[PDB]
């Protein structure tokens, strides 16, 4: 059909639950999922990894791949989910540029959690190796105090609906309710 | 839709017309297009250039990115086009692995053209900012790329004389096979 496709943006600071949530949305809505960190990991596996500067350069490149791949999916009329710790200062204009070549209707989910919970997750994920080593995640005492005192990520000013999901206490999260929230908005 | 999605594979050696043709298929069928060269270009722009082994590594990584992206698109039930100079020895297994995690119905288009025309195109692309004598000799004498043994329909398109290519006919050839698999 001629309908404008939906672009579901899942954002949040690192460790706020955006990975799990975006994956649940992909399974629940049967939609393609483009994740910055997943793209970075494909690149670390193909080109190698080293230090934080390389991680940053690979991340900037992964973000470029995310927008490139999104455009061709949206141009086919298919909806999709994009997940990253999006930055208002740079991603607002990237989303505008995307919209110009591949029109979409935005739906945004922002994940948040307490500093203490975020610090616990960052540490355990790195200790238990759930996190790819190439990311070279800043895990020093200063880094963790910055994580702890950061507050919630600002959402992208895209228009359209926004849901904020606090994952501080995961037991309180009803994933199907979140999927249904998106479905209702896709239906409109 | 619950129909198995199609995976349209556009293969060919460099400069055989696989780029233009895959773009015509994407726009003509309104499907996503994943191109090895296009992914490589995004990576060179973000990471830079160096010795030609780097380009080789970037190429290998772009391919991995192609299969990564294809999987999620196919898993949603959406059909797509993948364009590359696919290699029988490595991409046969990668396509099998993809099928396991993201079932698809393959449709293949292989582009070919005379070596002389291929050299001309490559030289002009090199000259028009868009190649050793060994590189060019390999281009001229190499012969046609082997198609991937994936089953499904195969169409070979000889682009030595582009004026005689009916692009719509090719679109409808694929579209008829899509209707056949619905
Ligand atoms: Cl997360
Ligand atoms: Cl070409």
Q: What are the residue boundaries of the structural domains of chain A, listed by start?
A: 1-188
Number of H helices and E strands in chain B, helices first, is: 7, 5
Of the residues A48, A65, A67, the best mutation for testing chain B's interface (the one with the most B CB atoms within 10 Å of its CB) is: A65
Stated in angstroms to one decimal place, the resolution of this structure is 1.7
Cβ proximity of B81 and B34 under 8 Å:
yes
* Segments in chain A forming alpha helices (H): 18-29, 36-47, 52-75, 88-101, 115-127, 141-148, 175-187
Ligand having the closest approach to the CA of A38: 1
The structure tokens listed for A142 are 């200063």
What residues of chain B lie within 8 A of the CB of A60, using their CB?
Answer: 46
Instruction: Give the list of residues 6+ apart from residue B22 with CB closer than 8 angstroms, or none.
Output: B10, B33, B35, B81, B83
- Laid out side by side, the sheet with B80-84 consists of B33-35, B80-84, B6-12, B105-112, B154-158
Taking the CA atoms of residue B42, residue B48, residue B54 and residue B60 in that order, the dihedral angle to the nearest 10 degrees is -10
For residue A32, which of A10, A59, A2 has the smallest C-alpha distance? Answer: A10
Cα–chain-centroid distance for residue A79? 16
Method of determination is X-ray
Can you tell me whether residue A139 is helix, strand or coil?
coil
Topology of A1-188 in CATH?
Answer: Rossmann fold (3.40.50)
Cβ proximity of A27 and A75 under 8 Å:
no
- Laid out side by side, the sheet with A105-112 consists of A33-35, A80-83, A6-12, A105-112, A162-166
Sign of the CA dihedral with A95 first, then B30, B78, and B66 last: negative
Q: Which residues pair with B35 in a beta bridge?
A: B83
Cβ proximity of A41 and A181 under 8 Å:
no
Instruction: Give the list of residues 6+ apart from residue A128 with CB closer than 8 angstroms, or none.
Output: none
Query: Rounded to an integer, what distance in angstroms lies between the CA atom of residue A84 and that of residue A34?
Result: 9
Class of domain B1-182: alpha beta
How far is the centre of ligand 1, averaged over its atoms, from the C-alpha of B98 (Å)? 26
Q: Which residues pair with A77 in a beta bridge?
A: none
Within 10 angstroms of residue A46's Cβ, the number of other Cβ atoms is 17
Buried residues in A7-22 as b, exposed as e (16+ CB within 10 A): bbbbbbbbbbbbbebb
| Packing angle, helices B52-75 and A52-75, rounded to 10 | 50
Sign of the CA dihedral with A83 first, then A88, A94, and A97 last: positive
Q: Which residues pair with A82 in a beta bridge?
A: A9, A34
User: Which DSSP letter does residue B176 get?
Assistant: H
Buried residues in A76-97 as b, exposed as e (16+ CB within 10 A): bbbbbbbbbbbeeeebeebbee
Q: Which strand (E) or helix (H) includes residue B102?
A: none
The conformational region for residue B129 under phi > 0 = left, psi -120 to 50 = alpha, else beta, is: left
Subunit contact A61:B43, Cβ cutoff 8 A? yes
Subunit contact B32:A72, Cβ cutoff 8 A? yes
């Amino acid at each position: 059909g001629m309908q404008t496709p939906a672009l579901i943006i899942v954002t949040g600071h690192p460790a706020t639950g955006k990975t799990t949530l975006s994956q649940a949305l992909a399974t629940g809505l049967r939609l393609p999922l483009l994740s910055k960190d997943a793209f970075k990991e494909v690149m670390f596996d193909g080109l190698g990894w080293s230090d934080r500067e390389w991680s940053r350069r690979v991340g900037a490149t992964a973000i470029m791949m995310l927008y490139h791949t999104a455009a061709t999916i949206l141009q086919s009329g298919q909806s999709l989910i994009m997940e990253s710790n999006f930055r208002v200062d740079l991603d607002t204009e990237r989303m505008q540029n995307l919209h110009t070549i591949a029109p979409f209707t935005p739906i945004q989910i922002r994940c948040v959690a307490s500093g203490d919970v975020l610090v616990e997750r960052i540490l355990s994920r790195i200790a238990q190796g759930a996190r790819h080593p190439g990311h070279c995640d800043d895990r020093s005492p200063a880094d963790l105090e910055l994580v702890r005192s950061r507050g919630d990520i600002p959402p992208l000013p895209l228009g359209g609906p926004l849901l904020t999901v606090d994952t501080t206490f995961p037991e309180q999260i009803d994933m199907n309710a979140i999927v249904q929230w998106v479905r209702q908005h896709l239906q409109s």
